[PDB]
Amino acid sequence: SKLLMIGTGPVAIQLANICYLKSDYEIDMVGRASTSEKSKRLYQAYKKEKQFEVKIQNEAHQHLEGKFEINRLYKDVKNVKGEYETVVMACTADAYYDTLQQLSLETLQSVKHVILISPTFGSQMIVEQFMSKFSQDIEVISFSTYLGDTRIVDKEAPNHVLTTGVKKKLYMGSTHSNSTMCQRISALAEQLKIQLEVVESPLHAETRNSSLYVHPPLFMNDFSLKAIFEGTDVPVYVYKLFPEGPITMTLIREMRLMWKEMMAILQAFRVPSVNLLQFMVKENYPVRPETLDEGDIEHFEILPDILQEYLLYVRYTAILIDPFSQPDENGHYFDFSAVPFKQVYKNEQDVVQIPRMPSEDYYRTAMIQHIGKMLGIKTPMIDQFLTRYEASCQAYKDMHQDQQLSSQFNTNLFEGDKALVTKFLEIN
């Protein structure tokens, strides 16, 4: 009953409050002041108040709120010592390996369960294969996504967070069928009034994340890459139609193609296919009954290619506005699609960063590409996505030689992660 929570962002804090209130674990958290001004402000803020706080916006989510203290906030990963039964990874998926590899042998030998909160497709494999050198029977659990939306209102008080939304449905799988830890997590979800479908494997759960299929076409195209890396004459928007945004028949086709390459990969692992339209429409953002035929939603996976694309395009067009918002007196609804692209930006030490979109999708897609090679499945759409992103990175370096740039601009990243997946797939 010690828990190590890797991450100090909003997600980590929400999760830490849940553990504090609903579990018997003594909770230690770990940041990275050694490489992050964000982490250092969190550490400094917690040191001062000796409290974290979760607020909510909608009283529907009361049970998530609270003020709490933890046992120990570690300033950096390398400081971690001792034994922990359970490790929770509330960092971004690209840091799982790099973070675990900094823990001590003593810590790593003690671990029974690693719980991955926002893994990509392939994360459990990386983490299981890694932890295997230290443990004979490591249990790894993957969720589909984090449970909701949590943020910091005020950058200067990053120990106070606000959960604004909770997802309707989440998925979870374990390396160990119907384990004690699965059942405890299931009982916890019930207590939190969150629906949780237990699926056969972590990989099954990792594939129930709409972002895997959608972010790459949306962000790794010429229109978007320009908006993020170079800028635009007038503001453009992620979810709008060309020329206001990237959405085009071309983009929708690239999405279908990527989805099918992913469905081929999933057939190899014998994981069920994902009805991308049903997911979008019944689990994410609803549309009016008049917009899409219920038969077309249900049968999406077996409909002709051109029809799958038409339905995706139509879906995106239907959420240009929030059709369930209150129209004003001129018949105008809330501009739900007016989401700006975040541009490349200088941190407070003048180092250029690439924003989460598409930083993190480069990692996800790079891993999907690598699984693909190892299984002998072709992924020409994936490949092109990655090529475009690499081009934009190289173009930025050539164009901004007087600028200090983060390691995100380098090639070829993720060698350790790739080696572990390679090894895991030789063994099964």
Binding site: D149, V238, Y239, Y285, I319, F334, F336, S337, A338, V339
Partner: peptide, 4 residues
């Protein structure tokens, strides 16, 4: 409020 917006698309996430």
């Amino acid at each position: 409020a917006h698309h996430a």
